[PDB]
Design an enzyme around this catalytic site. Structure first.
Site, PDB file in Angstrom:
ATOM      1  CG  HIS A  20      -3.102  -2.759   3.923  1.00 29.65           C
ATOM      2  ND1 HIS A  20      -2.259  -1.550   4.487  1.00 29.65           N
ATOM      3  CD2 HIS A  20      -4.505  -2.251   3.434  1.00 29.65           C
ATOM      4  CE1 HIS A  20      -2.785  -0.332   4.024  1.00 29.65           C
ATOM      5  NE2 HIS A  20      -4.112  -0.873   3.702  1.00 29.65           N
ATOM      6  CD  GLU A  25      -0.120  -4.871   7.161  1.00 26.79           C
ATOM      7  OE1 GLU A  25      -0.202  -6.392   5.466  1.00 26.79           O
ATOM      8  OE2 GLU A  25       0.146  -4.148   6.888  1.00 26.79           O
ATOM      9  CB  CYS A  49      -1.181  -0.004   1.288  1.00 28.06           C
ATOM     10  SG  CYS A  49      -2.264   1.445   0.854  1.00 28.06           S
TER      11      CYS A  49
END
Length: 185
Positions: free
Chosen positions: A165, A167, A75
């Site tokens: 993202h 994560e 990102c």
């Protein structure tokens, strides 16, 4: 294998856990000194301009440019790795791509969907204020993921940039492992 995660500001417990699940040691890079002793660096984040300013303010900008570290930009990291976004902002200018910020607009909060990764398979990606690749400036830039006609993942040697993202989903560790196995090892 030690993977550093840029976090001049912010919490990276999620990124750290994904790195551990991928089978590596995680290291928080908050100040310039933290860059020492790592095998690769992950540059995550939402809004890119704030992170760009922090990198310069604390000196991480020039330090990273002076390193030959493999880098995974997600990102904000995709934007930062690029050599252009059409708007005047601080960039690392490392990866041979230009990026279109807020590619899906600023009216929708987020969206999640499975993304096909080259030579891997499907990964669940969480997109929030996601940028996409615009121009590809070099013959060695490889497209590793798309969302329709939008390029959401590219690789150039030791560099990798993604729109979402990793994560934020359970699949995060797979993505991190994909990066390390293809850009670091």
């Amino acid at each position: 294998m030690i993977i550093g995660v840029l976090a001049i500001q912010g919490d990276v417990e999620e990124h750290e856990e994904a790195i551990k699940k991928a089978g590596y040691e995680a290291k928080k890079v908050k100040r310039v000194e933290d860059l020492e002793g790592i095998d690769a660096l992950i540059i995550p984040g939402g809004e890119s301009t704030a992170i760009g300013k922090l990198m310069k303010k604390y000196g991480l900008l020039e330090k990273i440019k002076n390193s030959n570290l493999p880098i995974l930009g997600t990102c904000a990291g995709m934007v930062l790795l690029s050599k252009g976004t059409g708007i005047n902002q601080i960039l690392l200018e490392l990866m041979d791509i230009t990026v279109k910020r807020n590619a899906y607009g600023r009216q929708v909060d987020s969206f999640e969907k499975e993304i096909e990764f080259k030579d891997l398979g499907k990964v669940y990606g969480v997109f929030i204020r996601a940028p996409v690749v615009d121009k590809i400036l070099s013959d060695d830039v490889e497209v590793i993921a798309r969302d329709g006609d939008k390029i959401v993942g590219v690789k150039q040697g030791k560099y990798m940039a993604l729109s979402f993202h990793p994560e934020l989903s359970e699949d995060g560790y797979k993505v991190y492992k994909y990066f390390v196995e293809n850009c670091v090892k």
